[PDB]
Amino acid sequence: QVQLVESGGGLVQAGGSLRLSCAASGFTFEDYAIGWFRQAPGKEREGVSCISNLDGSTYYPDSVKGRFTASSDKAKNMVYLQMNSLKPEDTAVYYCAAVNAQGIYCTDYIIGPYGMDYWGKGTQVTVSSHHHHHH
């Protein structure tokens, strides 16, 4: 059985950082590309990062490029998404997904209309101008 488990979500002050992790199991990690996606209520799901465990290629849309960085640790079958300089509009459920990486390299198409093979259940990220009001 395949599982993708996201963790690292939370509620953070605007300008702050989070690090999401995607724990993968049940498939040959190095043969796949892992994408991070997000969906906020009222919007369509969108790709925020791609990393290929096969060729090391990465892709980020302009909305997050420079702020978010994906990395892969094959010893743990984990992919991370370091998110810096978070903005309120980055609030969303974040999902990780996997797709066979043979014959592809990371682009907007891979994390867009191409489709993924496996999906995680998602982790909530909330970015607040007044985080102190919630804890």
Domains, the chain = 1-135 (2.60.40.10)
Query: In sequence order, what E strands does 9-77 have?
Result: 10-13, 18-25, 32-39, 46-52, 58-59, 68-73
d(CA 97, CA 4): 7
Resolution value (Å, 1 decimal)? 1.4
- Number of Cβ atoms within 10 Å of the Cβ of 128: 16
133 contact partners, CB below 8 Å, separation of at least 6: none
Residue type, 105: Y
105 contact partners, CB below 8 Å, separation of at least 6: 52, 55, 57
| Residue 57 CA to its chain's centroid (Å) | 15
26 contact partners, CB below 8 Å, separation of at least 6: 1, 2, 3
